[PDB]
Amino acid sequence: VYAWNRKRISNCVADYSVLYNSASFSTFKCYGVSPTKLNDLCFTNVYADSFVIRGDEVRQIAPGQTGNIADYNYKLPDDFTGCVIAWNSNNLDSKVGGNYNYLYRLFRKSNLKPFERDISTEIYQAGSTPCNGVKGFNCYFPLQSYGFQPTYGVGYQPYRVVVLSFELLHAPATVCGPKKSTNLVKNKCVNFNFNGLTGTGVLTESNKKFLPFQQFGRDIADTTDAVRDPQTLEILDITPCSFGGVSV
Amino acid sequence: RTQLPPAYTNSFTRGVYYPDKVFRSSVLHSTQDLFLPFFSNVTWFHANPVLPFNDGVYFASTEKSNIIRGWIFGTTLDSKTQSLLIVNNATNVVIKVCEFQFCNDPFLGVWMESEFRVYSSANNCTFEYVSFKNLREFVFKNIDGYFKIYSKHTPINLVRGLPQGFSALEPLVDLPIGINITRFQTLHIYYVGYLQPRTFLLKYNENGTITDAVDCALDPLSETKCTLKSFTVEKGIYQTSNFRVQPTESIVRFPNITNLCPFGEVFNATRFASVYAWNRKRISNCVADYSVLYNSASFSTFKCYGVSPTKLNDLCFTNVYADS
Amino acid sequence: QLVQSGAEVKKPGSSVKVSCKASRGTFNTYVFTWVRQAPGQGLEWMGGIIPFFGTADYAQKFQGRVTITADDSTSTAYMELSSLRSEDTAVYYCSRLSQWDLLPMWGQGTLVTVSSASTKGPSVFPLAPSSGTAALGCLVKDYFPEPVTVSWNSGALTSGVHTFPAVLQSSGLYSLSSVVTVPSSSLGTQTYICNVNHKPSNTKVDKKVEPK
Amino acid sequence: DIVMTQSPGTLSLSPGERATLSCRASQSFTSSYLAWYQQKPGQAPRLLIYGASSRATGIPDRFSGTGSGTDFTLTISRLEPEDFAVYYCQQYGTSPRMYTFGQGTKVDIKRTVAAPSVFIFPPSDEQLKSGTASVVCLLNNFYPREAKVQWKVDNALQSGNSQESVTEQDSKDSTYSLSSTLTLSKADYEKHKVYACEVTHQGLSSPVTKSFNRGE
Ligand SMILES: *[C@@H]1O[C@H](CO[C@@H]2O[C@@H](C)[C@@H](O)[C@@H](O)[C@@H]2O)[C@@H](O[C@@H]2O[C@H](CO)[C@@H](O[C@@H]3O[C@H](CO)[C@@H](O)[C@H](O)[C@@H]3O)[C@H](O)[C@H]2NC(C)=O)[C@H](O)[C@H]1NC(C)=O
Ligand SMILES: *[C@@H]1O[C@H](CO)[C@@H](O)[C@H](O)[C@H]1NC(C)=O
Ligand SMILES: *[C@@H]1O[C@H](CO)[C@@H](O)[C@H](O)[C@H]1NC(C)=O
Ligand SMILES: *[C@@H]1O[C@H](CO)[C@@H](O)[C@H](O)[C@H]1NC(C)=O
């Protein structure tokens, strides 16, 4: 857990109905997004963080939470936009003699910042005496070993926990859902959808001068007025179709 | 090994970069971010110590043949921690992130380059990427474990100091290195400023390029410009902000309390009374910690209503009733 | 689980400062007490302090000579006793009582000695039997420091052997007696040799007891 | 203050029996608590009952404690060979001034009253060459441990010039041994001829005096 593995995913199509449909996941909780709408969406990158913790520690994995694991091992930002999945690993990560492979940090000079990983093995100094790399009283090893035996209760049974964090910056989308790209239509009131940015407008070829790193042209009212077609890098405006009063 | 003493210079108007990758035209947007303060005291060097990184650094260098070829970032610049090395050689911008035991005198020789002696070790690599006359300016910052690098190259004819002009700084790179960077150093074959959390009023021209900006916290005129969302201020009197004297210090005053609350007799007691006869104890005239109880996980349930345990240690009460 | 200072040996009239180190920030909220016990004597409470308040209470006997302080930076409570005397040679303990449990912990103990210190070999004196069963022994006198191992006939004779615990002299050295009762007929028909070994002085004395 | 009295001073019960100790306080514990501790010779004190009614970790269930007000009772349902040691009752609480102890109670194997075997050893000639004379008085295999030894030199009582060492209860006969050493200068030893020690013990109907003459 203190060495939670991190994987970066981009430039690939990913479904998300497959995971949700399967019931093998004990915990499947999304924040800032819902699994039902997750299929038809795009993101700039996906970061998957994988680790193992006991069931009682599962509550520590959530935005704005506190705890030993939360404070010293794996911290989530308050603005987390992603899904936490977790399932029981007692069937595999439990030894009759005690599974000591997995270790959790127990002491740190401060609470871990979100998405900050440390694997320091220096002996923690709990007192004024400088612990010169020698274990002893008030000189505690930073990590501690889980028991993780089959005989233990569910609250201590090991669990595999994955945290998928989708980051959607103002950059071209590289992880999209299992949705095909239709054919573009211009100069007509249509229900467009660019990288999951829905809306209704009349897509028209524009004379705006986008920069290479720009994707959305915002408006005074924070309404996406100009967009960059991902398949063909041209800039298209978005004008509301038409409206007005109907006097009689 | 000899190093030139550092000088100082005026920052003028440099340090204006697109805070976002969103196109805006002819709108006076307002932003709050880590900017280079206008008219700041920028350190000046000549061709290299270990400069602290703090919270984002603006780098500038006047070059004509790419004399400065890269930068190094890191906390201790040793094998104990991770570090980042960037080298812009010819047409390749090689960026790497590993644990390097950097050489005390990094050297790059040349025209054909064949000498590259910067680090003595490289272990546990995590990322790699490959891409006077010219003033090259860069902005490096680390926010939420993300390293952002903005750049801008301009044609100049001067060596005295930072030119008295205005220009934008386009982004180049954003990476998830997630490194606690507190120190950095350039690489020889310049000027350095430190960012601060300011508020700017950027002006986007017709083609979405910044042309002028106003540092709202600089001086009253700039603050009035920001309040009015304009650059031209007509004769008059405008209310800009509010002025409040900040507290000088902190005062904590509690009574002449001397004892410790006997909470042992209601928690560690050998036996507990029946629920219909719930035992009650009044606690008064004593001092009791509360982080100690919540630090111990032996409690199956610990739910506070109307108060939070963290804010419970620093608080006073008339009497505390413990019902067991 | 407290950690105290190591065993100390001091001259008479000096002062000894015994520490008691506490783990983590569990220092101020608890109550520390210093209690001493002389060898072969009962438990004698000395004092008690609360680091959060800093006021230390002392037993009426120990008023003046002893003083109890506490430092939060090192999370250690110290008790310093001045004008040390031989009567102060005792085992001291620090007991910490918590706010939420009536379970007073104890330190491992610290031995404090106040007397003349030297590395001297024991003097073995054969206490001859008085002229059915008679007793004969050996006096191990004037040795320092502890311990000494006394056997009879190099350990062959064990029946009836009583090796009394050493008693400290007013001179700072130890006196011990190791006796054995044997039938009066065996006094002259069996040679008894008491072997006394002193590892700190590395002295081995084999003294033969002869009836008078 | 608060005064703690333990009764009996020394409890002599055989293993397998039921042991009872009483701790009486001069004043009730309005905001304090009591604890029972066990200590063995050459070993640090061990806490047995905390809060006066709760057994510490690892304590056998045979130990229990009750009481209130100014009187408390420690009970052992079954007595074991490992259970024969010294016992103390300590009153303690949050306030540091509430920290006092009892004088202590000793638990020993009950045994028939054994009359001490009294022996007297004159100082060895080798010790006399050193300028000091040590007269030794041995009480071998006596029970109970309580005994009184008085040194008499020429029918003069000696006080403050003798040291006594007492062994623990024997593991075979459940008896005790005592050794009293009377130390004198060589000149003083030569100033007197008759040296004796009188032992008063429960196993002796009358005190037994063992005497010797300097030179014989
Ligand atoms: C009175 O209190 C003591 C100790 O008090 C302890 O510390 C306080 C600050 C609070 O947090 C208390 O909740 C806490 O108990 C109790 O002794 C304790 O007993 C428990 C029994 O479950 C012991 O737990 C054990 O822990 C080990 C791992 O160290 C496990 O392997 C065991 O299976 C078991 O769970 C605990 O170690 C022990 N603590 C001490 C210091 O001895 C005592 O039970 C309590 N009595 C009453 C009547 O409340
Ligand atoms: C995307 O693929 C199509 C067909 O493979 C191709 O015509 C189009 O040019 C591609 N897009 C870009 C930006 O190259
Ligand atoms: C910069 O700082 C130096 C001393 O650190 C000072 O002498 C100089 O006047 C400063 N320059 C400006 C423009 O404030
Ligand atoms: C914007 O682009 C047009 C296109 O030629 C150019 O004529 C004009 O000068 C540009 N203006 C600015 C402010 O960049």
CA of D106 to the centre of ligand 1 (A): 30
Min CA distance, C111 vs chain D (Å)? 11
As a whole number of angstroms, the distance between CA D180 and CA C130 comes to 16
As a whole number of angstroms, the distance between CA C17 and CA C35 comes to 14
CB-count exposure of residue B252 (10 Å: 0-12, 13-18, 19+): exposed
Could you tell me if D102 and D124 lie in one domain?
no
Q: Is the CB of B41 under 6 A from ligand 3?
A: yes
Is A217 close to B23, i.e. CB distance below 8 A?
A: yes
Resolution in A: 3.6
Could you tell me if D94 and D20 lie in one domain?
yes
How many folded domains does chain D comprise? 2
Q: Is the CB of B10 under 6 A from ligand 3?
A: yes
Q: Does domain B7-244 have CATH number 3.20.20.140?
A: no
Min CA distance, C94 vs chain B (Å)? 19
- Ligand closest to Cα of B11 equals 3
Could you tell me if D150 and D125 lie in one domain?
yes
B23, A218 Cβ separation under 8 angstroms = yes
User: C77: which chain A residues are within 8 Å (Cβ-Cβ)?
Assistant: none
Quick check: helix, strand or coil at residue B221?
A: helix
Question: Residue D196's beta-bridge partner residues?
Answer: D152, D211
Atom 2, ligand 1: residue with shortest CA distance: C101
Method: cryo-EM
CA D165 to chain centre: 11
Question: Residue A37 is encoded by which pair of tokens?
Answer: 């709408």
Nearest-Å Rg of the Cα atoms of chain C is 23
As a whole number of angstroms, the distance between CA B185 and CA B68 comes to 11
Atom 35, ligand 1: residue with shortest CA distance: B298
Domain extent at residue C28: 3-114
Phi and psi at residue A2, to the nearest 5° = -65, -15
B59, B172 Cβ separation under 8 angstroms = no
* Mutational pocket test of ligand 1: of D57, D59, D64, the residue with most ligand atoms within 8 Å of the beta carbon: D57
Q: How far apart are the first and last CA of chain C?
A: 56
Is A218 close to B22, i.e. CB distance below 8 A?
A: yes
CB-count exposure of residue C86 (10 Å: 0-12, 13-18, 19+): middle
Looking up residue C80, the CATH number of its domain turns out to be 2.60.40.10
Min CA distance, A169 vs chain B (Å)? 9
Q: Which of D82, D108, D134 is the last residue of a domain?
A: D108
Report CA-CA distances (Å) from C97 to A43, A157, B263.
Answer: 57, 35, 12
Q: Which of C92, C114, C136 is the last residue of a domain?
A: C114
Could you tell me if C191 and C102 lie in one domain?
no
How many folded domains does chain C comprise? 2
Quick check: helix, strand or coil at residue B220?
A: helix
Residues 6+ apart with CB under 8 A from D46: D37, D38, D39, D40
Q: Find the residue in D nearest to B268 (Cα).
A: D51
Q: How far apart are the first and last CA of chain B?
A: 73
Total residues belonging to chain D: 216
Residue of B262, B269, B270 lying closest to D31 (CB–CB): B262
Nearest-Å Rg of the Cα atoms of chain B is 29
Question: Residue B278's beta-bridge partner residues?
Answer: none
Could you tell me if D28 and D84 lie in one domain?
yes
As a whole number of angstroms, the distance between CA A219 and CA A223 comes to 5
Looking up residue D35, the CATH number of its domain turns out to be 2.60.40.10
Domain extent at residue D99: 4-108
Q: Which of D108, D140, D174 is the last residue of a domain?
A: D108
Could you tell me if C80 and C127 lie in one domain?
no
As a whole number of angstroms, the distance between CA C94 and CA C77 comes to 9
As a whole number of angstroms, the distance between CA D114 and CA D21 comes to 25
Residue of C33, C56, C162 lying closest to D99 (CB–CB): C33
* Pairing, β A193-194 against β A216-217: unpaired
Report CA-CA distances (Å) from B312 to A162, B324, D48.
Answer: 34, 20, 35
As a whole number of angstroms, the distance between CA A39 and CA A176 comes to 8
Q: Which of D108, D127, D151 is the last residue of a domain?
A: D108
C153, C193 Cβ separation under 8 angstroms = yes
Neighbours of B235 (CB within 10 A): 4
Report CA-CA distances (Å) from C163 to B61, C201, D108, D176.
Answer: 89, 20, 20, 12
Quick check: helix, strand or coil at residue A226?
A: strand
Nearest-Å Rg of the Cα atoms of chain D is 22
Q: Find the residue in B nearest to D97 (Cα).
A: B259
As a whole number of angstroms, the distance between CA A218 and CA B27 comes to 11
Closest by CA position to C172, among listed C194, C149, C141: C141
Q: Is B307 on the interface with D (CB under 8 A)?
A: no
A146, A103 Cβ separation under 8 angstroms = yes
Domain ranges of chain B: 7-244
Could you tell me if C59 and C153 lie in one domain?
no
B251, B229 Cβ separation under 8 angstroms = no
As a whole number of angstroms, the distance between CA C118 and CA C115 comes to 10
As a whole number of angstroms, the distance between CA B215 and CA B229 comes to 12
Could you tell me if D138 and D86 lie in one domain?
no
Could you tell me if D132 and D82 lie in one domain?
no
Could you tell me if D125 and D181 lie in one domain?
yes
B167 HSE (CA, 13 A, CB side): 17
Angle at C96 between CA C95 and CA C100, to 5 degrees: 140
Could you tell me if C14 and C97 lie in one domain?
yes
Could you tell me if C87 and C23 lie in one domain?
yes
Could you tell me if D20 and D88 lie in one domain?
yes
